[PDB]
Amino acid sequence: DEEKSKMLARLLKSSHPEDLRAANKLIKEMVQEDQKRMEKISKRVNAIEEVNNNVKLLTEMVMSHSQGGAAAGSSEDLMKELYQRCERMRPTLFRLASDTEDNDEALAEILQANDNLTQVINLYKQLVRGEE
Template identity: 60%
Template structure:
């Protein structure tokens, strides 16, 4: 969790008034990369959202929303638990921090919970938590979601180019660009930036996947050849070293493939390729164990 905390501290630094998108993105990447990330991140975020420093709390809410958009289903499952929702409710409740939390932070928290009831209608606990806030009079009326918050998290549907297929975003963008209000134009600007960034990240992911899969198949092929020679006891000293290096590299590729598979939820073909590469890798590692150990 050390890396997670480090990036979160940078992303929510109260002395920096602007959002630090690079650190926010790094935090999200870390949540995805760490096996414990999705369960640990909400706890760290809750602590920051409850900060008495308004800027820190607002930054933390931006980080939370970015994670909801980018960190996948395991993260969604964690924030939909009462354990996390209660931490958000404490910011609003006069029994806890509601009396001294700033209005700005409280309205952002209300907005966040309300937007989730819209985006995740299947999550009963979120709806229950929100209804309870209304019943207790802590939330008087449903907030109006700001223009640039209308976008629900990307749905897990296969997409070609983000610009072609995300009709909702394109419609929203067209509407914002027609507006004469400066806030709308700022929202449009943010939306364009996020769409471009998404597109870049998507192609970076694809090339990482292609490169990893091709490295796996080359290594597997080379290892197979060397193992055949090893069985026939025709391996030179330098070939033995090469075999050892390949073995170590293949060991390192395993967790990499595993991570790629967990990131590739929206593309069945790509996932099949990754799993196939993983099978080849496991087979060659098994053969190495048999041949070299015997």
């Protein structure tokens, strides 16, 4: 916000005991707003980083077992556990979109995120755990 970011700089530059008092209440609050934000942002970012990675990893595995590969048991297992974690995440993403009501850009990342999430889940469910 380039607006406050200028009203403050003039309250601080002020010379009256009343502008200081305000710049303070402003700072006090801007600092609060910047705390809630970052926290929101990290929650989403971290979540998405996991999803993307877990997506890629499992995707890789599932594919190694497409005609030859994946130690059937010690590889066939990591997957099973990876998968479940993806399933376990659908919930988190959905609540994430639900809470991301102020930034369609992020919201969209969460949705892209979720498609990929569901896509791989419908590939472990398909080829692999589906055929046999």
